[PDB]
């Protein structure tokens, strides 16, 4: 299909960037003192 | 409670109904006559069933000019003979 | 027989209306139940009678 050839990178960064932001925040939360 | 007379007190009292067996029917009748006399049509400019089209006309009297719209409407009304 | 019929049927309707209001009021009223029970018996027998009357006279008016 003649899709937009940037759709792949757009979707991939759309998922990855905020997901990564959240994982960073979660993981640095867990490692704080109990 | 906020200080006003309870509604149930008011609407279960004789005086309320003395007032309102007059005022309510009067208003209802006034609305009725507002229509039945045809005054509503005149006030609002609503076509009567015989005033939508001239006898042989099948074209909508659509307003097509912003600033001469008033005149346009008046002309459409005039063309109803 | 049309006079008999049309009035027996009007009387059936009228009595029915009377029973419809009267019976529950009687059943639930505290006083005068003695007079009521007999009035209800009378009304009921008369209602049944009028039903049968209208029913018979039907075939002499249709």
């Amino acid at each position: 299909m003649e899709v937009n050839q940037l759709g792949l990178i757009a979707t991939a960064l759309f998922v990855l960037v905020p997901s990564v932001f959240l994982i960073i925040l979660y993981v640095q939360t867990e490692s704080q003192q109990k | 409670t906020t200080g006003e007379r309870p509604f149930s007190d008011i609407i279960t009292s004789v005086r309320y109904w003395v007032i309102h067996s007059i005022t309510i029917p009067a208003l209802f009748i006034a609305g009725w006559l507002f229509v039945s006399t045809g005054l509503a049509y005149d006030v609002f400019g609503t076509p009567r069933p015989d005033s939508y089209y001239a006898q042989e006309q099948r074209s909508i009297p659509l307003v097509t000019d912003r600033f001469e719209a008033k005149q346009q409407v008046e002309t459409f009304l005039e063309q109803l003979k | 027989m049309t006079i008999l019929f049309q009035l027996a049927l009007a009387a059936l309707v009228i009595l029915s209306f009377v029973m419809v209001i009267g019976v529950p009021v009687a059943y639930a009223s505290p006083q005068d139940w003695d007079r009521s029970k007999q009035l209800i018996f009378l009304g009921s027998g008369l209602w049944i009678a009028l039903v049968l009357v209208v029913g018979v006279l039907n075939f002499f008016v249709v």
């Binding site: - | 309870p6 279960t12 009292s13 | -």
Partner: protein, 38 residues
């Protein structure tokens, strides 16, 4: 003047029947005159 003279259940029954009558008229009007399609 005195609150309570006319029982609220009567007020409700009468007002309610009035509403039923007027709405009923509007539905009759759906089948007659303007808007009746006839």
């Amino acid at each position: 003047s005195e609150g309570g003279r006319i029982p609220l259940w009567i007020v409700a029954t009468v007002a309610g029947m009035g509403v039923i009558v007027i709405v009923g008229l509007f539905f009759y009007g759906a089948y007659a005159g303007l808007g009746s399609s006839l």
